[PDB]
Amino acid sequence: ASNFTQFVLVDNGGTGDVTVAPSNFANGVAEWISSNSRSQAYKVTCSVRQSSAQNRKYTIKVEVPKVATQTVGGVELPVAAWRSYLSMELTIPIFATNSDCELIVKAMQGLLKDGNPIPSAIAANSGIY
Amino acid sequence: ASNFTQFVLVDNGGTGDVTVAPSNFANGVAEWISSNSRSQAYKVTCSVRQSSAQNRKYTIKVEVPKVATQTVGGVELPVAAWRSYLSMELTIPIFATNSDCELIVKAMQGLLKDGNPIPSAIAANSGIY
Amino acid sequence: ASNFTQFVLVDNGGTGDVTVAPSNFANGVAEWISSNSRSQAYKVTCSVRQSSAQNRKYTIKVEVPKVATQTVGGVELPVAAWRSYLSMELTIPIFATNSDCELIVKAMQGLLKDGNPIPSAIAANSGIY
Amino acid sequence: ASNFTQFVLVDNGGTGDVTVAPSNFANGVAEWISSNSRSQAYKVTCSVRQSSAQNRKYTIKVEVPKVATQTVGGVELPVAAWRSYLSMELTIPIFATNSDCELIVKAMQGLLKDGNPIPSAIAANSGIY
Amino acid sequence: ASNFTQFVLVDNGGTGDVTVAPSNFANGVAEWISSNSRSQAYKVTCSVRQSSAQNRKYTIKVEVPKVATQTVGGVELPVAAWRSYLSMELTIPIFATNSDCELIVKAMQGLLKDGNPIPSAIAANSGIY
Amino acid sequence: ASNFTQFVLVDNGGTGDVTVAPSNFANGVAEWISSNSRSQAYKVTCSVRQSSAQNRKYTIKVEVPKVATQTVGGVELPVAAWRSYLSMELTIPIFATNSDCELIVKAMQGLLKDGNPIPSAIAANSGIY
RNA sequence: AUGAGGAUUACCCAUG
RNA sequence: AUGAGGAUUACCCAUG
RNA sequence: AUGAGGAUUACCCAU
């Protein structure tokens, strides 16, 4: 294959889409970044290694900028007030076949599918109630 | 409303769908398990806490099992050959708007959409290259 | 440009073709793994480093697995009955030009060419005679 | 029958062809040396031995010389400016059938096939990238 | 894309051009070397790290050799009489826009443009006066 | 000669050009500064000294202002958020002739030439990938 | 609070 | 983190 | 750094 390619991170139906493209590959850690100042960019990083003798583990990180009242290209401090951080860690036993892995991916897609509890809770500054 | 409802975790087109439902909320940790014996069930847990003075942190966990029947002491028991674990932590500043949060959700959905680099790598037991 | 890509390790015409793809490149050690169960995958690693003042040293490593199913307690897992390990080390002085290196490669290819003493001895559970 | 014979180590079509011929086979170590000055000759050695109870272990060794003339005191001698050393060790379990071995050989040939990552990296004084 | 491609380092109008190509990416340090023996090659290395919490730092190195043939122990070896070293560090705030960065690049290009003070002084073995 | 003269640092094709002119010569350290408040100016400094008995060394420093959302003449804090710093250090052995030095300058120009990896990486808030 | 730190996964480890 | 600090250049030195 | 040293193969071992 060669999966390290540009892709659409935020899909707003063609118009207003946020595309993130490869920007670094130091130490096997792939990185995609949107076209912004590094302080306001959407950032995605991913890597895999065999955590133990029994498992392999993907470490996926995502950074999403606060947009409401944002000043494009401006200096916005404190940084912690303007950014959200996602840190995923997927552990998969070495016995998992391609099929097993496809199932795992589907489970992840379903977890975040539109309308389901988790995503709708997050999207509303809410918890479970 | 209420968002603590059941949802289909693994969608196999209506037939063979892994649907998970509410099962516990003790200690502020919402739990969903698939309709199986506790030993072979799929598990999803979620919780939100106001970590910093200015951050809210979601902690989500998903467990995908590889169901199997094991003969222990000459008796067959429903068990799991192994489990795949997804542990994710999402940190959102309190200044995030609902619109700002929807953006985070959309990013996560685009991250795992079919065909995009990351889910592709995972499903093929490979890294990004 | 990039040479850290997917390639054919075993060529069985166009069918049994064993392909190994990049998986990780941490600490100057490149790693390729064939698809499906990590437990039954082929592995190839490589690294170069300045061993002494005048020498650079390559460390190639290959693993050929014997695919098999392991049944225990009635639970079967994809495993490798055993593995064949290849560990080679190539030392090349810094005075070697690209031409000198091409020659070294030809020597390695010739060593293992079909019909020659060494490869044919190995292929037949034999030694030299 | 005999596989301890002369063979082509470097194939330069039908001209620069480096041929190496048997020279000695003492203590289970077969040795091939190219013709002319031992000082500027190519060397190849090989041996097999039962490393452990279930493993047999091959130890192949190759030397590629950089032909040069050494003048000292007005006396010139055929020497090797330097040498490139290849030291490989192949371990094969005793359960390996002739088929398993043929596969192992194909893996070795594939590893060094023209155009693939490793051989092409070596041939260019490069590493992986 | 990919930006890890070869490029002409020293342009002598198509004839005698010193072109350098990718050769290593181990440890997050991209390396390019000219098509020579490792001992006489031109070398270019680059790396980026997020130094401060709000800075990104590029570290670039270039090595220009003075090729020579040295007689060591009565044998001739390709070597470098000496080397000229360029070590540059560029610190860019994370708030820098792509446009802000293009400005940095243009400044560096204008800095070394033919006829301008600095490259003039360097090329004449003198200081600024 | 007398190279300490005003020159164009950022060339935007005649219109919008950034010219930097001599502004200080204390301690043999030449300084050029653009026509701005010292906090928002483009600054260039250069000096040469014999670092050791074998080498001479040029120390070139450049400072480039963040322009996006900049407020001309305003007080912008923190300073580290609004400025980029370039620190070049060129070491040249005392044996280098004028010609040798011209080569070194060309190498530097080629390193930063438009379209080449290093400059295009910087100009895109990127690394090598 | 961090960790391309580990897990048997609502637990354990290291450093602010 | 600095250094018109040094190098044999992906290494070493001094001070925040 | 070598070991026709061992390996659960980027570990372990004498010199």
From Swiss-Prot, chains A, B, C, D, E, F:
Lineage: superkingdom: Viruses
Record bears the keyword Cell membrane: no
GO molecular function: identical protein binding; RNA binding; structural molecule activity
GO biological processes: negative regulation of viral translation; regulation of translation
InterPro entries: Levivir_coat, Phage_RNA-type_capsid
Keywords from the named record: Capsid protein, RNA-binding, T=3 icosahedral capsid protein, Translation regulation, Virion
One GO location term (cellular component): T=3 icosahedral viral capsid
Annotated coiled-coil segments of the chain: none
Primary role: Capsid protein self-assembles to form an icosahedral capsid with a T=3 symmetry, about 26 nm in diameter, and consisting of 89 capsid proteins dimers (178 capsid proteins). Involved in viral genome encapsidation through the interaction between a capsid protein dimer and the multiple packaging signals present in the RNA genome. The capsid also contains 1 copy of the A2 maturation protein. Acts as a translational repressor of viral replicase synthesis late in infection. This latter function is the result of capsid protein interaction with an RNA hairpin which contains the replicase ribosome-binding site.
Family: Belongs to the Leviviricetes capsid protein family.
Full protein name: Capsid protein
Organism of this sequence: Escherichia phage MS2 (Bacteriophage MS2)
